[PDB]
Amino acid sequence: IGVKQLQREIVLPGLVWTNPLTDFGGSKNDTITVRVPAITTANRRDLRDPDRTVIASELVEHSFGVTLDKHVYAALKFTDEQRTLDIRDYTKQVLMPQVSAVAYELEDYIAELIEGAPYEETILIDPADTVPAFITADQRMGEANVPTDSRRLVVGSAVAAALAKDKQFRHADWSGDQANAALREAHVGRLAGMNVIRSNAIAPDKAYLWHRTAFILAYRTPVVPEGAKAGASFSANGVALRWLADYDYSQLGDRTLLDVFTGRKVVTEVDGSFVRAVELQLQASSITIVGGAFALATTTGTKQLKVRDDNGTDVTARCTFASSAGTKATVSAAGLVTGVAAGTADITASYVPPQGGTAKTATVTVTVP
Amino acid sequence: AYLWHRTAFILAYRTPVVPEGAKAGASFSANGVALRWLADYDYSQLGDRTLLDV
């Protein structure tokens, strides 16, 4: 009646360098070789030197390859036994979910590209004062002579929450914003010269700053084969896709496929050091378990634990779980606890903070009925 | 070298009809002999197939 499933929002595809070069089909191995102009070095002699020779400099221009190497598709197999009496409107019950699925897959592709880049080091964000971390991020990317324009800053939900909670932005006297956009709203627009963009695709407690020429996305719409009954050019997030439906008679079920060809590249420098983007991670100091002490439904009951640090990030996947009394109940490595006997047990969750040192410890009590 | 009257070698040709499970395409023809052109995408192999025949 209007209740829709909760789904993410698309920010990342518009914030990367998409299709600077297109003719991938004209090159061997589908690799286009981008060249970089050469630079040289001068030399210094001494006046009136008896030695009258000159050191000859050299002009060497490097290059790197961009390749199409992935084929993102969403394939649906529904039989004509369900097409004419189950789906009422095709263009809103199957086509739109398929397009949204491909769009989210492309966003995840870009997010893996951003997070998977070979960052040399991570800049720590102190939750008490977050501005020094971002100014340091701006400073690291200025020592590499990266241009000051076309820089994008994408923060996770946790970093945005910490920015709003920061007294540098929350207190009007400490920020000069005599409207407290960080108090009346939770928004912190401009920061250290960088426009903050909130996102959920990236890890919740991380932020990424990158120049426009740091990541390259290449897209190609597969050409619709002449041998297909259907065929369209649905567009998702400004990236056209190929939709192809074939009425296969192998099992009397028509199949559909919505696909595109994708390629990613990180623009490393000539010395193989990545300096056109930096990453920041929110610093953590303690962890707790939501729900506190609880009780299972049965003696063999199962409950999925959930650990949150002081920042509020779900750190369940990054914790090691131990049971004080495994004879009554045990806990999986993923946080799920199963009781094996009635009685009390103590569960310890350990999380190494993202700055090194002794891991934080959170202890909870589980009463298996 | 062969010397033959016109009514001495007869060749009969037929252009097949396009099946239901494939498209039609163009109307190519050999030297007078018309030809049938097909196209049938193979979803199971993600590939397309084409055929001229008579």
Place this chain on the structure above:
Amino acid sequence: AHIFVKPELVAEIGVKQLQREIVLPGLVWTNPLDTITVRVPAITTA
């Protein structure tokens, strides 16, 4: 010394594989049709 980045150019100059000239189809009787029967007439003697 100096190193340059260049693309392997590919060009077409009109050199093509040599193919036979088609002559025979056209000189042989042809009919666009499962089968066709002929109707040779009958001769007699006086």
